[PDB]
Subunit: 111 residues, 4 copies
Amino acid sequence: PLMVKVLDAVRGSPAINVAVHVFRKATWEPFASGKTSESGELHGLTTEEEFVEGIYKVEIDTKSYWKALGISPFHEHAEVVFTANDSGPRRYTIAALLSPYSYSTTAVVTN
Amino acid sequence: PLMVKVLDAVRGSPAINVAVHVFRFASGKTSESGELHGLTGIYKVEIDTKSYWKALGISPFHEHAEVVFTARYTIAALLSPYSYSTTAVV
Amino acid sequence: PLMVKVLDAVRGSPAINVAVHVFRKATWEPFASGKTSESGELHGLTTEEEFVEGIYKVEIDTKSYWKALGISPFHEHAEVVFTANDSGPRRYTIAALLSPYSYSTTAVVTN
Amino acid sequence: PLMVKVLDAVRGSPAINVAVHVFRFASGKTSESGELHGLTGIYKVEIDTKSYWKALGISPFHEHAEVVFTARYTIAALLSPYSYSTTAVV
Ligand SMILES: O=C(O)c1ccc(-c2cccnc2)cc1
Ligand SMILES: O=C(O)c1ccc(-c2cccnc2)cc1
Ligand SMILES: [Ca+2]
Ligand SMILES: [Ca+2]
């Protein structure tokens, strides 16, 4: 139900081993977290049972990622905050593209 | 020293009258050119994209666009209903 | 060796049935073309045998796509032009994100 | 009526002295603020991103950024070595 995919615009590659923290609005309660794979993807964050309606924030730790590659980051993280499952359960993929001074995110939502 | 600019990728225009709150702090609403001047460590710029889309009658994915960075800075955000990108020019 | 993936930022979905034309620099010679799947992906454009070094242009037909959905497009197409395989064969994925008045593309290149 | 603006997403700055050729037509190189004024159906704006990156000592993926559209227009391009995004504001 919640997938994150991250690409690196500086290296021309997936963004590998990037930390992703998901929080749910209670204050922001920790909900789920993970690290992207060698494909830049993070599956297994959560389950249909755990993924309730509410306001979720996904924070992708772009600062650590760039610092580990030896690159100066501008942002602390790339984030996405969205209301989930309000009219019914859905599946969300958050796709992100990273550069040191810019990031882009989009959502794909399926029923 | 800190400017915010907001653009609409659907209609190809500035995003007018968008609420922008800066934390660490400053706030405003965007002008007819999509810019917010005169707002004024680690800063958060929270752009009320949900109200912008809903005024247009478009269902948007995000609650807001929040951009968090360490500190003359221009923070631009390009909006679509299910995406946003943001840039810093310094 | 050459994959294209396309997402729609207006609908929150893959960009389905979008035409993609690839040309190689001779004038631009037709090289390969296809349409994205229900996942927004286009596999099977070309083969390791056919994919030689050279300058390639990938043109994604964003105008037809938006017109078919009833949306006014600004661009004629989203394009990407790049030198391929110069220091050796590689695999290229071109990922694109579409809005009516904007598009983004990135490349993932693997050996 | 037609402005071009080019920004660098790696260094967080305008892209200075970039060659831009418009077809249908006009050409120029970007200024210290990354803008090209005074350039002046279907138009192509070809931005020489490869020369920009190679002057910085960075190997870039694209040959150029070419943006083709049907026609006051601002065409912005945000550059990274393996990506570019482009916006039209009208
Ligand atoms: O289909 C995909 O895997 C995929 C497609 C496009 C992106 C993408 C492109 C540009 C900006 N942001 C995200 C990311 C992933
Ligand atoms: O200053 C501007 O006009 C301007 C600033 C930023 C962008 C932009 C942002 C994200 C992706 N692509 C382009 C575009 C234009
Ligand atoms: Ca509900
Ligand atoms: Ca060679």
